[PDB]
Symmetry: D2
Subunit: 338 residues, 4 copies
């Protein structure tokens, strides 16, 4: 028995979620609605043509001023900047995908429940500790149907947590730091312009732009043994999608690169299959575009210095790979629904 | 002499301050800047520029509402509503409208309600009755009696001066143009919401066709050209400098060397500093921070079938346009009261 | 009865030719060899992973120091900078695809015949008038098996000639000029460096770089009525693939945009089906990536000024669309072979 | 005073001429340039630069084998073989090896066979016995008796000075580094032939992991660091400026403010002009055309678990490295004979 879904914010994340879900062979989700500010004309066009994903093979059409069609499946399009006006009760909306990035606290996110929706799934870190956070392949087992509002974490935390988990079990972690060399996002300005963060203000395709990240501390939400053990930053570089995590950890049990790669390979062929991948080919960022996995370990880059300083480089598609996790977590809510 | 206010401290407002600050002789005294970001944003973005490079000038935050450039202070007002702005109080003669939001008599009009005597719009006027000027083409028809004026678009400022030579020397039957244009702030960094589904597309990944009023707009500064020119823009992945590609059927049969000589006459005399003729085989980045409106690529000038003229002209859409903005505002200074 | 093919120069064109051909449902070609300077390791890697085409779905493997495998089909890899040493006689090589761009005159190209090859197919304009030039959908009918050496023209001439043909038949052309706003190529330098052309010397991804083009005069080789009627230039901009032709022609019969688009639509639905396309969606360069057609008319951009000045904007994928023509022309030689 | 020859007029050779030409006081006199492109290529690429911008200097072609910069002539020899070069005839004291092709005693040695007394390699030495120097770290150990010397790599020049402070003040146990590096000439514009299958990939489209000797190379100028440091490079789509990300376990437990103060001590005194400490929140392009080797991003300095130090340092891999090349060559001038 499938569950009825609404997508709030038809952005990079909302559209990637639709194409991720649409391409699944078997699903318990049925997307019926999309709150989109630009109406049917925007939602239908940007859904069909995409500068990073490419052209959607499915058939996209505008049925009328309130609806679009994907391969004949009708979808209601609504438009309210204020979520309280959204028709969640009338359309019997079980689950919302909150991809706007504005309604990420419990007050704002609750409005979708208030407008009659049964559950909310934040496509980002929540802004309060009261909202439970999950990473598929790490702690999705701990999700309970009683949780009305859930967080699927950051794209970077989705890359970091699965391989951090393996390191923690196999070698044990004392402390560490990370750098995400991350593709530019819609938050950065195209040319130098207004922004509360004076780095993110600078022309994105011209510059290496340092920015703060919560992925290093956020890992502790899904892996309690990591509490206070990691910090880090990000460097936004002029690529439109695909990112890489550079992790330096001090480990308890002295090791070597081949032993650290064997641990990742055990996890990849076993319990983290589909989430963690170990790549042995000497590839580049574009080769990781549209990968389904959360993290791809660059095997040849793994480096151990002085027996216990371990460096791991992990590729992730921050749009698509994260979207394939958002479809996974939503499926867990569908599988658990009362 | 005249006391200038800058509304909207974006690429054109910040280009205007650096251009004006670089004039040896200036009749303009920039006293106020309206920026939402406050002294801390304005000081930072004036000083660090991804395109322009670091301002050589000493820029500091004096207090909560003032910055100094080489010790000269400027007030930072912060209202999205022009009607609020204290220009009666600050005795503001002229206002530079770099917001792109107040483009009509009513929108532009609000600055004058607030005390300013005149408005200079760094963009085409939305309203017909607003006179538009291109320095080196029709700035002579400028009059103090005009309270709200337009400095046209960056593309129109590149096109109008060379079109002017062509119409004088050969005469124009009709013509079409393409501007291969550097991306701008209108465009989205990644595919996102936009009225223009083309401008919605990732700016740094694409050649993005878009509309241009620049061809028809030439008829505003050269009335002889009404209904003769049309064109499009191809926005491409460069942060500044753009190039106009014009194809015109002309009345007087001609050849490449003869067209270039006509441009060179104008370059050396009446349009010096507005029109340049470039002989070296350069690329867009070499036209960065050029003060001229138009740089004819002399070797690209082509004539086919005697009367079909193709001209390729470079322009820094930020810096060259901004130098013309400084020039139009200076003209209102020399014609003031 | 299929013909045996060798690819000389496993560059952007050689590799695009292999993937174009490999993806054809029915073909009379059987690629058996590739002269590649970088040996099996280069040819196998760059064939599998591609920054513009993306990852090849087929199975690519190195069988030994002289061979690679594509989906189990074995291919001999050789390496001679000097074509005279190539094993064309011993491998019974009927047809060579000359994609090096160095052996494009009749003396250099003949060396592949001299080394025992039966025919040569230059992936570029030939440097002498003695080598016949063909454009599929315009003049491929005039190709004769007796022609040992053939030219498939430039990517730009492949975009220009099909739509120029329609204009010439329907309205008749007096004179015109073109601009190709073209993606950067391997000929341009990444950073400012040595080049005989001081424009092409300048950093390609930083600049709009003017360059000479023979596509405007080259059109007269396939459409003799165009002789001396067109000239033009190119502007190389910082995109890695996909280009656009901006054509301004003076026509005899006075017309309007909708009439000019109707002519292109008649050709597209009729005799130029698969080569000429009319696009009504407001798209951008990336949307034309990996298109099979030689030319896609941007319908909404078509413009007529003063009754007889006509402007047409035509998108073309200079790598893939051109490669789908190179596979087409090679098929015509296979279909005509004695 | 000393008569300098530049072999290989690429990004480093052209950066060297502009850097040297900008020194108020110089003991160097650049008399000859070996460029395959001839006076017409050298004059053009010295004058027009996609990164550096237009040379303010007057550059002209005097004749078939000479260019003038601000009237000073330079001879343009054109031989791929250094053994051919007429440096006995031109009385060439020092040769700047910017080709990247003659990196060993034998390859570098050919310039001296041809008449030159000394060779300065703008890259790591292929041969062990060739001494390498980093200005602000170990240039004091420089001696005239060394006929062939190395100025190390751009990354090593960024790393070595701040590593030096860390080893003095806190001491280094072991450490790893990543340099997020601007693309270079080694890399291909579109996927094409390369020994390094990663460097084969389109430079402006990708984050491209590559090897670096920069971590181990620090042990050449700081012998205390042997076997303590390793690293990689991520080449990214920017034309210049790069940033070193170093994580080191140190002996003396410490905190962010204490590490930054140690860098600031070095910046204000012994490493002034080699090491800078930046407090403003800048981006890579703001570090363009900086003369310093290293720019510490003060706010990014992080200390985790008391003894794991992360430092983020900017460097213009072209211009800052080139200013160090000018500095090493100057040192051979002040120690000459
Ligand atoms: N893109 C990534 O790499 C990535 C990765 C993981 C997490 N995220 C998170 O996903 C969220 C969205 O990111 P994105 O890249 O898709 O951004 P985006 O800008 O592409 O998407 C945001 C969309 O929401 C719309 N919107 C804004 N306010 C709205 C409102 N009140 N009601 C309805 N729609 C509204 C916008 O107009 C836009 O269409 C953010 O929280 C971001 O941090 C992004
Ligand atoms: N950039 C060019 O190449 C160029 C050159 C010629 C003309 N123009 C014209 O210049 C104008 C400015 O363009 P730009 O590229 O600098 O844009 P921009 O977005 O960089 O600058 C706009 C600035 O105005 C501010 N602003 C917006 N609404 C405001 C309000 N209500 N009150 C106060 N400030 C407000 C914004 O915060 C921003 O700082 C436009 O009209 C544009 O058409 C552009
Ligand atoms: N890429 C395009 O957009 C495009 C379009 C149509 C026409 N063309 C033409 O196709 C040809 C190749 O272009 P490309 O973009 O594929 O270039 P490329 O540089 O990607 O391909 C050239 C390849 O040939 C190899 N090669 C060079 N000399 C050789 C020799 N003596 N023997 C064997 N191999 C040799 C090179 O090492 C390289 O692998 C040129 O004539 C070009 O004008 C290019
Ligand atoms: N570019 C940087 O960021 C940087 C900074 C530090 C060190 N380096 C080192 O500087 C050196 C030069 O690098 P680059 O980026 O300027 O490379 P480049 O390719 O721009 O410069 C090389 C120049 O040498 C010329 N050359 C090649 N072989 C020659 C020969 N046999 N005889 C004469 N001239 C010859 C080439 O034609 C070219 O003009 C390399 O060793 C590099 O490792 C690079």
């Amino acid at each position: 028995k499938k569950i009825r879904v609404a997508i709030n914010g038809f952005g990079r994340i909302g559209r990637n979620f639709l194409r991720c879900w649409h391409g699944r062979q078997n699903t318990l989700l049925d997307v019926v609605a999309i709150n989109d500010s630009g109406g049917v004309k925007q939602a239908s066009h940007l859904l069909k043509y995409d500068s990073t994903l490419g052209t959607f093979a499915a058939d996209v059409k505008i049925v009328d001023d309130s609806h679009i069609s994907v391969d004949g499946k009708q979808i209601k399009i609504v438009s309210s900047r204020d979520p309280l006006q959204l028709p969640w009760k009338e359309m019997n909306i079980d689950l919302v995908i909150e991809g706007t990035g504005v309604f990420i606290d419990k007050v704002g996110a609750g409005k979708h429940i208030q407008a009659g929706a049964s559950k909310v799934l934040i496509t980002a870190p929540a802004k309060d500790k009261d909202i439970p956070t999950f990473v598929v392949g790490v702690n999705e087992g701990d999700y309970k149907h009683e949780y009305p509002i859930i967080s699927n974490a950051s794209c970077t935390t989705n890359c970091l947590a699965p391989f951090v988990k393996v390191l923690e079990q196999k070698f044990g972690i004392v402390k560490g730091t990370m750098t995400t060399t991350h593709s530019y996002t819609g938050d950065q300005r195209l040319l130098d312009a207004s922004h509360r963060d004076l780095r993110r203000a600078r022309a994105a395709a011209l510059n290496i732009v340092p920015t703060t990240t919560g992925a290093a501390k956020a890992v502790s939400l899904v892996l309690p043994s990591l509490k206070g053990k990691l910090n880090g930053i990000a460097l936004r570089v002029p690529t439109p999608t695909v990112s890489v995590v550079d992790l330096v950890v001090q480990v308890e049990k002295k090791t070597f690169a081949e032993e650290v790669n064997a641990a990742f390979r055990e996890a990849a062929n076993g319990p983290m299959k589909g989430v963690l991948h170990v790549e042995d080919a000497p590839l580049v960022s574009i080769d990781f575009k549209c990968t389904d996995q959360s993290t791809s370990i660059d095997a040849s880059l793994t480096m151990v210095m002085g027996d216990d300083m371990v460096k791991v480089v992990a590729w992730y598609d921050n749009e698509w790979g994260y979207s394939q996790r958002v479809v996974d977590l939503a499926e867990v809510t569908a599988k658990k629904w009362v």
